[PDB]
């Protein structure tokens, strides 16, 4: 169901974090993810993986894999993405506007003072909700770009992911 896309998403995210952001698991993480709070977990194992580097390419890079991953989706799958934009981000959007609207959402949301100017190297994440298939638990990875800015885009993308499992 959604698992493939998430993995596929996660892989392009790391593949493109190296090829463009020039990062490595061995790279020193300026910011690191502390704890992952799910208010209602009904089948999701969420792990953090460090692909830290040094942010606009991180941001530009994460946008690429999302766009490419959305494009790969079957049009009849992709029709589900706008409902989860409204639910997860309170964004009004449609199939043809996904790439732009998300783009500007992350550009606008994640380039805000609250993000860049925050003094915590260990940042938490809170997620309302996440479901897993009975017997088949959704397994997801939070790629720690290493900067507030990049993690914001990761977060936004994770809020859409978890929202999908409903």
């Amino acid at each position, epitope marked *: 169901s959604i698992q493939t896309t998430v993995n596929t998403l996660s892989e392009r995210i790391s593949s493109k974090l190296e090829q463009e952001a020039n990062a490595s698991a061995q790279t020193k993480c300026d910011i690191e993810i502390g704890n992952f*709070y799910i*208010r*209602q*977990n009904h089948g999701c194992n969420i792990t953090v993986k460090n692909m830290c580097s040094a942010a606009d390419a991180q941001l530009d890079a994460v946008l690429s894999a999302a766009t490419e991953t959305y494009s790969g989706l079957t049009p009849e799958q992709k029709a589900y993405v706008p409902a989860m934009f409204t639910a997860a981000l309170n964004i009004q959007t449609s199939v043809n506007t996904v790439v732009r609207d998300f783009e500007n959402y992350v550009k606008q949301t994640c380039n805000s003072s609250a993000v860049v100017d925050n003094k915590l190297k260990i940042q938490n994440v809170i997620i309302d909700e996440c479901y897993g298939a009975p017997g088949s638990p959704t397994n997801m990875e939070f790629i720690n770009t290493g900067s507030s800015k990049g993690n914001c885009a990761i977060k936004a993308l994770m809020q859409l992911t978890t929202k999908a499992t409903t």
Partner: antibody
Amino acid sequence: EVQLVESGGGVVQPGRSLRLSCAVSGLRLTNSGMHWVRQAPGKGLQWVAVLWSDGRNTDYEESVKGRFTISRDDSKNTLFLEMNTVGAEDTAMYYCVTDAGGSNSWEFFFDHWGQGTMVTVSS
Amino acid sequence: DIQLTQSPSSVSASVGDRVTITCRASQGISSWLAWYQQKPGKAPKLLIYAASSLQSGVPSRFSGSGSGTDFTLTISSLQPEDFATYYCQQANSFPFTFGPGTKVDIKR
């Protein structure tokens, strides 16, 4: 019914250490997130720290991060707050509380409260 | 951090009065808001969760409402045992913060 019973309070000198205990009946800690909440004399309530159901993940209010350690002993179903570098700002009634959430959810509100244990930090 | 303010700072009532306390959050918190009751010398006790859900056992004359930034806690018919200080609390994000309290005393 869920019973939470704190102990360990007392008078303590600045910079030194203390351990508060909260004995819990009616519920297994492995099945509940847990918190500590303090109340300085004459003041409001302030959240201190949270321990996960798994007994190991944790978070802290900024002011006490580094100095306090929240943990538990499953064998005894007891929650603990280890206070190591106490200043007079830490004077307070310390309340052990339960997150209404269990091993698969978080609510971040506090449905059961202990009777309280008072810590006075003074020279 | 999320600041919670409470109005009125105090209130005096007779037994049977309708009493309403307000809690305003510095930022939107949806319905992640709870209210506690506390009496002198005693631990807080939870009354309302998720803005409008009454905690089991709590007398039916307590209710809450609101979502976003502005919330209310109403006692439809104050009873001698309701004279106490009331605190609201946000459950949206760390650190979990509390309002300053609103004391309800016996009118004379």
